[PDB]
Write a protein that binds this ligand. Sequence first.
Ligand SMILES: *[C@@H]1O[C@H](CO)[C@@H](O[C@@H]2O[C@H](CO)[C@@H](O[C@@H]3O[C@H](CO)[C@@H](O)[C@H](O)[C@@H]3O)[C@H](O)[C@H]2NC(C)=O)[C@H](O)[C@H]1NC(C)=O
Ligand SMILES: *[C@@H]1O[C@H](CO)[C@@H](O[C@@H]2O[C@H](CO)[C@@H](O)[C@H](O)[C@H]2NC(C)=O)[C@H](O)[C@H]1NC(C)=O
Ligand SMILES: *[C@@H]1O[C@H](CO)[C@@H](O[C@@H]2O[C@H](CO)[C@@H](O)[C@H](O)[C@H]2NC(C)=O)[C@H](O)[C@H]1NC(C)=O
Ligand SMILES: *[C@@H]1O[C@H](CO)[C@@H](O)[C@H](O)[C@H]1NC(C)=O
Ligand SMILES: *[C@@H]1O[C@H](CO)[C@@H](O)[C@H](O)[C@H]1NC(C)=O
Ligand SMILES: *[C@@H]1O[C@H](CO)[C@@H](O)[C@H](O)[C@H]1NC(C)=O
Ligand SMILES: *[C@@H]1O[C@H](CO)[C@@H](O)[C@H](O)[C@H]1NC(C)=O
Ligand SMILES: *[C@@H]1O[C@H](CO)[C@@H](O)[C@H](O)[C@H]1NC(C)=O
Ligand SMILES: *[C@@H]1O[C@H](CO)[C@@H](O)[C@H](O)[C@H]1NC(C)=O
Ligand SMILES: *[C@@H]1O[C@H](CO)[C@@H](O)[C@H](O)[C@H]1NC(C)=O
Ligand SMILES: *[C@@H]1O[C@H](CO)[C@@H](O)[C@H](O)[C@H]1NC(C)=O
Ligand SMILES: *[C@@H]1O[C@H](CO)[C@@H](O)[C@H](O)[C@H]1NC(C)=O
Lengths: 334, 87, 109, 127, 248
Amino acid sequence: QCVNLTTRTQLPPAYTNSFTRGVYYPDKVFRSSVLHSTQDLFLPFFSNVTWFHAIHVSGTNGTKRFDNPVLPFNDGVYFASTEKSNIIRGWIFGTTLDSKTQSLLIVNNATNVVIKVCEFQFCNDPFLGVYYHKNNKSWMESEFRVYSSANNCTFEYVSQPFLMDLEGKQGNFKNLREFVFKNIDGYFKIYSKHTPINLVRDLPQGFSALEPLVDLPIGINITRFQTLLALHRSYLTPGDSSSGWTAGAAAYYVGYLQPRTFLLKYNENGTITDAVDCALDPLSETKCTLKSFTVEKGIYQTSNFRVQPTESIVRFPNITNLCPFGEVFNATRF
Amino acid sequence: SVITPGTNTSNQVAVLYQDVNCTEVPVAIHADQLTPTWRVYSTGSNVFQTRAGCLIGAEHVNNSYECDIPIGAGICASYQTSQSIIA
Amino acid sequence: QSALTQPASVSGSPGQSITISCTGTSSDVGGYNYVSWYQQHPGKAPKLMIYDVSKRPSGVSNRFSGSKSGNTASLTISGLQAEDEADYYCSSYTSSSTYVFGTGTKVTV
Amino acid sequence: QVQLVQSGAEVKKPGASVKVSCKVSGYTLIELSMHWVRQAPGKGLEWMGGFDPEDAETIYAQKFQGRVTMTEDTSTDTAYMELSSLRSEDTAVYYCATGIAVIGPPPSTYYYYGMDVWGQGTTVTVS
Amino acid sequence: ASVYAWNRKRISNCVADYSVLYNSASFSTFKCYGVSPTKLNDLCFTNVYADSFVIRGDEVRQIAPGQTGKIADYNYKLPDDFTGCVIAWNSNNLDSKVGGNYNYLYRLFRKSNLKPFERDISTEIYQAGSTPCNGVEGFNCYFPLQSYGFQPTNGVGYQPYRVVVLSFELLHAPATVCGPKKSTNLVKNKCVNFNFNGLTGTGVLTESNKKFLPFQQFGRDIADTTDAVRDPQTLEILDITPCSFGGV
Ligand SMILES: *[C@@H]1O[C@H](CO)[C@@H](O[C@@H]2O[C@H](CO)[C@@H](O[C@@H]3O[C@H](CO)[C@@H](O)[C@H](O)[C@@H]3O)[C@H](O)[C@H]2NC(C)=O)[C@H](O)[C@H]1NC(C)=O
Ligand SMILES: *[C@@H]1O[C@H](CO)[C@@H](O[C@@H]2O[C@H](CO)[C@@H](O)[C@H](O)[C@H]2NC(C)=O)[C@H](O)[C@H]1NC(C)=O
Ligand SMILES: *[C@@H]1O[C@H](CO)[C@@H](O[C@@H]2O[C@H](CO)[C@@H](O)[C@H](O)[C@H]2NC(C)=O)[C@H](O)[C@H]1NC(C)=O
Ligand SMILES: *[C@@H]1O[C@H](CO)[C@@H](O)[C@H](O)[C@H]1NC(C)=O
Ligand SMILES: *[C@@H]1O[C@H](CO)[C@@H](O)[C@H](O)[C@H]1NC(C)=O
Ligand SMILES: *[C@@H]1O[C@H](CO)[C@@H](O)[C@H](O)[C@H]1NC(C)=O
Ligand SMILES: *[C@@H]1O[C@H](CO)[C@@H](O)[C@H](O)[C@H]1NC(C)=O
Ligand SMILES: *[C@@H]1O[C@H](CO)[C@@H](O)[C@H](O)[C@H]1NC(C)=O
Ligand SMILES: *[C@@H]1O[C@H](CO)[C@@H](O)[C@H](O)[C@H]1NC(C)=O
Ligand SMILES: *[C@@H]1O[C@H](CO)[C@@H](O)[C@H](O)[C@H]1NC(C)=O
Ligand SMILES: *[C@@H]1O[C@H](CO)[C@@H](O)[C@H](O)[C@H]1NC(C)=O
Ligand SMILES: *[C@@H]1O[C@H](CO)[C@@H](O)[C@H](O)[C@H]1NC(C)=O
C-alpha cells in the first residue's frame, strides 16, 4: 500500500470558464416569486475554474499521466466532474491530511456512501483499489489504499448513494456531477445537482441550482482538499505486464467560492431559475440596486458591491516588555 | 452612475464616475482588485471627460441631438446605430 | 488424464513457414476453443505466445499465429529464426475442468 | 512486476512427503488463479494442481487425487502443497504457474483459461 | 466525555418533556439564548444536538456566546448567534474520586483560538519556544492536554460540573422532535388561535394547491409573511389567511 502511482513530472493545469454555474439554496424556507437577496459564499460568475486531467491519454506510447494533487480548501470548493465511467467516487477533506489531526472521508461505493471523521494516515497517492477476489466471485473494493490506518473516530454516516447509481446515460450523453462544499460554524454543508449535458467538453451556459443534500456535524478544521479516484490493476489483459493501478480517465473541475452578494430569484414552484452577481458587471450592480432583473431606460445611482478586502493589515506600537499582570494578580498581600 | 437602455432592448451599459479626472479613474476605483468585467470599463478607447465626471462606455458624437437620458453637465446619452450608446 | 497428439519430429529452414499441429478428443479439445501454446527454452520458464486459439498477448512478434477449426488445432510459425528452435506444447481446457497438455513438439533449425 | 518465488530443491526418501512454497510479489494471490506443473525430462507436461477461476475450488486430474492436496495461506501470499506416499516416482520438476482471475475491466466477469505467469520451479528428486 | 473531545449526540423522533428531569436533579444553570424557557414547552424543534462534557465550576460561565477563557478559546467555542440552551449541574458525588480522578482532560495550550463548534482531538507537542520541539517534551515544550484532578474536598469552583448544551434550529425545517402539548382537532376556514409546528398565531386556514419539497416545511410569500405551512399529522399544505380582511 501507499505505492507511488504518480510520476516525477507534471503538466500545468488547464483553465476554463465557469459559465454562470454553482448557485445553491441558502435557506430551507419555500419562497415564491421573491427576488430575495442573500449574502453568502458563492462561486463568482465568469471565473477561472481549474480543469484537472487526472488521467490524460495521449497517442499510443504515452499511455496516461496520473495527477491528483492536494489543493487548499480555502473558503469552499465547487467540484464538477463529467465522466460517464464513474471513475471519481470520493473526496478527502482535512488539514495535515495525516494522523496528526483528524480528516473527513466521503467514499461513494455502489451499495452505500460512508462518511467517516477520524485521524486518517492517508497514502501519498490516495485512490480506491477496485479488484476481483476469486472467493466470492466479486470485483471487491479495497479502502486500505486510501489511508494506512484510522484511529480516534468521531463520526459515522451511512446513507443512500448520491450519484444516481452510475447509470441512466442511454448513449451519447454525459452527466455533470456538481458539488459544493462549505465549512461554517462546525457544520459541513454539501449541495449537489446532477444534470444531463450534451457538450462533453466544458460547462453549460445553462443555469441550475444545487439542492441541499446533507449537513454533517463534522466539527474539524478543513484547509486542504483532494479527491479519491477508482483505479483497476494494469494486469487486465493476459500477457500484459504492468502492476500499476491504471484505469479510465478523469476530467474533474475545481472552483473556489469567494464571499459575494447575490440576488437569487425563486420561481412559483420554489425553484431558483436565475441569479445575479452584484460585482460581475455594472448592469448586474444596477439590477442589485433596483432589486429587479428588468432595468428601465435611464441613469441610476448604484451602491457598492464590486470591491472586497483583499487582505488585512495591523499596526501596533513597538512594544517588547510583557505587562506585570503576574505582579498584580499574584501578590502576597492585597 | 450607470446609464443603460431598456433591458429588453440591450444589455450594454455606460458608467459615469462623478467629479473625478479620467486619468485618475484606475486609481479611484482600484481596478487591480476588481474583476476584469469592471476593468474593461475602468480604461478603454471610449472615454469622455465631462464636468459631471468621467464617462466610459459611450462613444462621443459631435452631432448634437435632443436629450432622452440626462447624463448631466450638458451631455446626454442615446442608444443609436450597429447598436451603441452615444454621448 | 489423456494426452494430446503432437508430431515430435519437426524441422525446417529459416525464413520458411511451418505449421505445428495439435489434435485431441471432443471430450477435451472438442469442448472449448481455449487451447494455448508455449515457448519453453530448455531449463527455462515457459512463455505464453497465443491464448484462446489465436489471440496473442502484447510482447510477441507478428511471426507467431494460430487457428483451430473442427477439432485439430494448429500453430503456424513464419519468418523462422535460429532462436525459435525449442520444445512446444498445446494446452486445452476440457469438460472435466482440466487443462490437458500434449506430448510436445521439438523443432530444430 | 508479477514475480513468482520458489522454495528450491528438496531431495527426499521414498514414502515421505514433500512441502513446496510459491511466493508472489507485485500482485496479490487473492487476485491470482494458480496452476501447478509436474515438468519431467523425456515426457510432456501434465496438469496436476489448479485453482479454477470459474469454480471457487482447486481440482486435479483423476490420476492424481488423494495422493496430493492443496493448502493456501493468503496472509503471507504463499501457496503450498502437500504430497503424500511418494515411493520413488516423484522424479520431476515442479513449476508454479498462475494466470488472471477474470480478464477485462471491473464490470466484466469474463473467465480466464490461462496459466500465464511461471516461476523458476523446484527440482525435487526422490532416491 | 472530556471537553477536548466533546460528545455530540443527535436526538430525533421524540417528544422532549423537561418534567422527567425535575425529580432526578436540579440544574445550576439553565440560560437559554434565543428562546425563552417558559415557551420551551410549546415548540417543535427541527433538529437538536446535545453536546456533553465536564468542566470546572469557575469555567461554567465560559460556556456562553461572546465569552473567553480556557474552555471558550481552546476547548469549546459557542457561536455568537446561538439558538440553544445550556444545562449545568454539580457532580461531586459522581465525577470525583477519593485521591483524585484524572480521566477528564482539557487543552491548556493551542496555537490559535477555536472557530465556533470546532473540536480538536490532536495531542501534538505545543511549541512554546523558539527551538523546535521535535516531538520531545522539555523546557518551552508542553503537552497540550492537562488533567483536571477533581477531589471530594475541593472547593466549589474546583468541583466537577457536568455541562450539556443543546443546540436547536427552529421553524426552518421539518421537525422530528417536538414538545409535550396535547394536539386537538383541526378546524379550517375559521378564525382560530392555531399552533402548527411551533408557529403560534391567530388566523384563518385555507386549502391551497401549493407543492412543497420534502426539505421545505414552512412557506413564506412575498414580503416575508407566512402564507403556507405543512401540517404534521395530515400532509396537506395549508394556506394561512388573516382573521380579518380589514378593508371595512
Ligand atoms: C486550521 O489549520 C490551519 C493549518 O494547520 C492553521 O493555519 C496555520 O497556522 C499556523 C500557526 O499560526 C501557521 O504556521 C506558521 O505560519 C507562518 C506563516 O503564516 C510561518 O511564518 C510560521 O513559521 C508557521 O509556519 C500555518 O502556516 C497556518 N497554515 C495555514 C495554511 O494557514 C489554522 O490555524 C487552523 N485553524 C484553527 C482554527 O484551528
Ligand atoms: C459498500 O460499502 C458498504 C457500506 O455499508 C458495504 O457494506 C458493509 O460492508 C462491511 C464490510 O464488508 C460490512 O461489515 C457491513 O455490515 C456492511 N454494511 C452495510 C449495512 O451495508 C459494502 O460491502 C460495500 N460494497 C461494495 C464492495 O461496493
Ligand atoms: C485515540 O487512540 C489512541 C491510541 O489508541 C488512544 O490512546 C490510548 O488509549 C487507550 C485506551 O484508553 C489506552 O489504553 C492507551 O494507553 C492510550 N495510549 C496512549 C499512548 O495514549 C487515545 O486515548 C484515543 N483517544 C480518543 C479520545 O479516542
Ligand atoms: C516515491 O516518491 C517519493 C516522493 O517523491 C520518493 O521520496 C521515493 O523515493 C519514491 N520511491 C520510488 C520507488 O522511487
Ligand atoms: C484566468 O487566468 C488567466 C491567467 O492565465 C487570465 O488571463 C484570465 O483573464 C483569467 N480569466 C478571467 C475570466 O479573468
Ligand atoms: C460470500 O457471501 C456470503 C453472504 O453474503 C458471506 O456470508 C460470505 O462471508 C462471503 N464470502 C466471502 C469470502 O466474502
Ligand atoms: C412546476 O412544475 C410542474 C410539474 O411538476 C408544472 O406542472 C408547473 O406548471 C410548474 N410551475 C412553474 C411554472 O413553476
Ligand atoms: C505565584 O507565585 C508563586 C511563588 O512561589 C509561584 O510558585 C506561582 O507559580 C505563581 N503563580 C502565578 C504564575 O501566577
Ligand atoms: C421588447 O420590445 C419589443 C418592441 O417594443 C416588443 O415587441 C417585445 O415584446 C419586447 N419584449 C419584452 C420581453 O418585453
Ligand atoms: C484634474 O486634472 C487637472 C489638469 O488637467 C487639474 O488641474 C485638476 O486639479 C485635477 N483634478 C483632480 C481631481 O485631481
Ligand atoms: C469631432 O471633431 C473633432 C475635431 O478635432 C474630431 O477630432 C473628432 O474625431 C470628431 N468626432 C466625431 C465623432 O466626429
Ligand atoms: C397520524 O395518525 C393518524 C391516525 O392515527 C393518521 O391518519 C396520520 O396519517 C398520522 N400522521 C403521521 C404523520 O404519521
